[PDB]
Design an enzyme around this catalytic site. Sequence first.
Site, PDB file in Angstrom:
ATOM      1  CG  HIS A  46      -0.600   0.550   2.431  1.00  0.00           C
ATOM      2  ND1 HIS A  46      -0.245  -0.246   3.498  1.00  0.00           N
ATOM      3  CD2 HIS A  46      -0.541   1.825   2.883  1.00  0.00           C
ATOM      4  CE1 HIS A  46       0.007   0.511   4.550  1.00  0.00           C
ATOM      5  NE2 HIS A  46      -0.165   1.773   4.203  1.00  0.00           N
ATOM      6  CG  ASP A  97      -0.265  -3.566   3.039  1.00  0.00           C
ATOM      7  OD1 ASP A  97       0.174  -3.209   1.930  1.00  0.00           O
ATOM      8  OD2 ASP A  97      -0.418  -2.760   3.976  1.00  0.00           O
ATOM      9  N   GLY A 196       2.533   7.008   8.531  1.00  0.00           N
ATOM     10  CA  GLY A 196       3.948   7.331   8.441  1.00  0.00           C
ATOM     11  C   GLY A 196       4.811   6.167   8.898  1.00  0.00           C
ATOM     12  CB  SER A 198       2.542   2.166   6.304  1.00  0.00           C
ATOM     13  OG  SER A 198       1.256   2.253   6.906  1.00  0.00           O
TER      14      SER A 198
HETATM   15  C1  SL1 Z   1       0.521   3.581   7.214  1.00  0.00           C
HETATM   16  O1  SL1 Z   1       0.474   3.834   6.002  1.00  0.00           O
HETATM   17  C2  SL1 Z   1      -0.688   3.331   7.966  1.00  0.00           C
HETATM   18  C3  SL1 Z   1      -0.187   2.755   9.335  1.00  0.00           C
HETATM   19  C4  SL1 Z   1      -1.429   2.639  10.261  1.00  0.00           C
HETATM   20  C5  SL1 Z   1      -1.144   1.937  11.609  1.00  0.00           C
HETATM   21  N1  SL1 Z   1      -2.236   2.248  12.515  1.00  0.00           N
HETATM   22  C6  SL1 Z   1      -2.266   1.752  13.775  1.00  0.00           C
HETATM   23  N2  SL1 Z   1      -1.255   0.988  14.271  1.00  0.00           N
HETATM   24  N3  SL1 Z   1      -3.285   1.972  14.618  1.00  0.00           N
HETATM   25  N4  SL1 Z   1      -1.673   2.554   7.281  1.00  0.00           N
HETATM   26  C7  SL1 Z   1      -2.788   3.171   6.888  1.00  0.00           C
HETATM   27  O2  SL1 Z   1      -3.080   4.342   7.226  1.00  0.00           O
HETATM   28  C8  SL1 Z   1      -3.757   2.496   6.022  1.00  0.00           C
HETATM   29  N5  SL1 Z   1      -5.099   2.998   6.194  1.00  0.00           N
HETATM   30  C9  SL1 Z   1      -5.776   2.714   7.308  1.00  0.00           C
HETATM   31  O3  SL1 Z   1      -5.284   1.979   8.162  1.00  0.00           O
HETATM   32  C10 SL1 Z   1      -7.108   3.267   7.589  1.00  0.00           C
HETATM   33  N6  SL1 Z   1      -7.657   2.628   8.794  1.00  0.00           N
HETATM   34  S1  SL1 Z   1      -9.274   2.209   8.607  1.00  0.00           S
HETATM   35  O4  SL1 Z   1      -9.850   3.224   7.612  1.00  0.00           O
HETATM   36  O5  SL1 Z   1      -9.923   2.362   9.948  1.00  0.00           O
HETATM   37  C11 SL1 Z   1      -9.719   0.623   7.998  1.00  0.00           C
HETATM   38  C12 SL1 Z   1      -8.963   0.585   6.722  1.00  0.00           C
HETATM   39  C13 SL1 Z   1      -9.355   1.280   5.536  1.00  0.00           C
HETATM   40  C14 SL1 Z   1      -8.620   1.196   4.312  1.00  0.00           C
HETATM   41  C15 SL1 Z   1      -7.466   0.371   4.288  1.00  0.00           C
HETATM   42  C16 SL1 Z   1      -6.996  -0.267   5.474  1.00  0.00           C
HETATM   43  C17 SL1 Z   1      -7.775  -0.180   6.657  1.00  0.00           C
HETATM   44  N7  SL1 Z   1      -6.938   4.675   7.738  1.00  0.00           N
HETATM   45  C18 SL1 Z   1      -6.530   5.533   6.827  1.00  0.00           C
HETATM   46  C19 SL1 Z   1      -6.302   6.896   7.153  1.00  0.00           C
HETATM   47  C20 SL1 Z   1      -7.198   7.639   7.996  1.00  0.00           C
HETATM   48  C21 SL1 Z   1      -7.043   9.016   8.305  1.00  0.00           C
HETATM   49  C22 SL1 Z   1      -5.902   9.700   7.787  1.00  0.00           C
HETATM   50  C23 SL1 Z   1      -4.973   9.016   6.942  1.00  0.00           C
HETATM   51  C24 SL1 Z   1      -5.172   7.641   6.667  1.00  0.00           C
HETATM   52  C25 SL1 Z   1      -6.330   5.035   5.514  1.00  0.00           C
HETATM   53  C26 SL1 Z   1      -6.822   5.788   4.405  1.00  0.00           C
HETATM   54  C27 SL1 Z   1      -6.665   5.367   3.059  1.00  0.00           C
HETATM   55  C28 SL1 Z   1      -6.064   4.113   2.789  1.00  0.00           C
HETATM   56  C29 SL1 Z   1      -5.538   3.345   3.859  1.00  0.00           C
HETATM   57  C30 SL1 Z   1      -5.652   3.789   5.213  1.00  0.00           C
END
Ligand code: SL1
Length: 247
Positions: A46, A97, A196, A198
């Site tokens: 991702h 991923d 950040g 990831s």
């Molecule tokens: C690094 O890129 C991050 C690391 C997150 C680790 N978080 C933790 N240890 N608590 N990975 C992402 O941000 C990937 N995401 C999300 O995880 C997403 N969480 S979710 O929406 O609750 C469920 C989900 C949706 C889509 C894909 C994976 C999981 N949150 C995102 C986000 C939210 C707010 C601001 C920035 C990012 C997000 C958004 C778009 C695509 C992926 C993710």
Amino acid sequence: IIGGEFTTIENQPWFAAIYRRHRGGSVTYVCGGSLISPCWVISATHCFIDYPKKEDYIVYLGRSRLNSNTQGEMKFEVENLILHKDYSADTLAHHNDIALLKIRSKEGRCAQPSRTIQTISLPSMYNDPQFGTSCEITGFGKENSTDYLYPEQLKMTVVKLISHRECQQPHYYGSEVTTKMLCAADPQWKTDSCQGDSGGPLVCSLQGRMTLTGIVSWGRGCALKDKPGVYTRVSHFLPWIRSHTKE
Ligand SMILES: *C(=O)[C@H](CCCNC(=N)N)NC(=O)CN1C(=O)[C@@H](NS(=O)(=O)Cc2ccccc2)N=C(c2ccccc2)c2ccccc21
């Protein structure tokens, strides 16, 4: 990293910092990674799915800071960018991923192990640390979900490996979490990985040895109560990693 503490690259010599060139002349930090062999770095798909162009990435090993210099660091270009074929994303989770990056310097050389640069061991085919084990995580990620800037100094923290039974249950997540994922969190919910972070490593003790157990993937928020961080279960991807790091 929310909470935890500031540290240096010596505490995590395997940590690779990944940067990307954007349109408009800007260069930004994208994700973290881990050096598994002198020429190979593993991260999350991702981190590159939206911009699959391998020529736009820059990898740093032995770097403790985001902008200022650290003596002994090494810059690398991405010779090959391998994204998992079965990758797919939902509004609930990322699937498969995981990604591999073959690095090389200007001379076409790989990583030279030093006190600040060393590879991390991979787990044994289907042999994960016992749940409840303490694991370390690192990265230059956010210190607060609300922040817009990443910290300048490398951070690390410790989290507990959570069982699938717990994580898969509705009081936490649900169906979206699979056996190809691992969950880890702070029982007090004050420290966790965040945006950040990831691609970064989840290091645990396996056979009395520090091992790459997971890759930072996703989570609802950052350090949210009853919402553990989810990592890519490295052990469930060993055949994949081996077939792509051949010749
Ligand atoms: C690094 O890129 C991050 C690391 C997150 C680790 N978080 C933790 N240890 N608590 N990975 C992402 O941000 C990937 N995401 C999300 O995880 C997403 N969480 S979710 O929406 O609750 C469920 C989900 C949706 C889509 C894909 C994976 C999981 N949150 C995102 C986000 C939210 C707010 C601001 C920035 C990012 C997000 C958004 C778009 C695509 C992926 C993710």
